[PDB]
């Protein structure tokens, strides 16, 4: 997936992403939601894309209260047969902001 530079951005910012497997650590990456796609990078320069997701197929949901994953403010984006993304926002305000935007893209 390629990002269109001259396209408006719905929201962008830091999120923590859990490793698919391994020691299951949280990596802080810079995320950008442009169009119905989610792109992420190393930092806020938004220079080289590290990964991307076509949201319309996905289901994105809050893991609920209580830090059940070991961190507060986590949510999960999944769709059977595709890669699951486990994400964490820094604050409730950031989580709400991301959930609202990601909902609009997926639908």
The residue ranges that bind ligand 4IP (CB under 6 A) are 17, 19-20, 22, 27, 29, 50-51
Closest residue (Cβ) to ligand 4IP? 20
Would you say 86 or 95 has its CB closer to ligand 4IP?
Answer: 86
**Which residues pair with residue 33 across a beta bridge?**
11, 38
Shortest Cβ distance from residue 42 to ligand 4IP (Å)? Answer: 7
Shortest Cβ distance from residue 33 to ligand 4IP (Å)? Answer: 17
CA distance 16 to 67: 14
Helix or strand (DSSP H, E) at 100: helix 92-106
Supply the DSSP string of 20-40, one letter for each residue. SSTT--EEEEEEEEETTEEEE
Shortest Cβ distance from residue 48 to ligand 4IP (Å)? Answer: 10
């Amino acid at each position: 997936l390629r990002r269109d530079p001259n396209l408006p951005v719905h929201i962008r910012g830091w999120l923590h992403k859990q490793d698919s497997s391994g020691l299951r650590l949280w990596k802080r990456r810079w995320f950008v939601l442009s169009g119905h796609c989610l792109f992420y990078y190393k930092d806020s320069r938004e220079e080289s894309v590290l990964g991307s997701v076509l949201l319309p197929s996905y289901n994105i949901r809050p893991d609920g209260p209580g830090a059940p994953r070991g961190r507060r403010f986590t949510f999960t984006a999944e769709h059977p047969g595709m890669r699951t993304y486990v994400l964490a926002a820094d604050t409730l305000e950031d989580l709400r902001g991301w959930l609202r935007a990601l909902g609009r893209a997926s639908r």
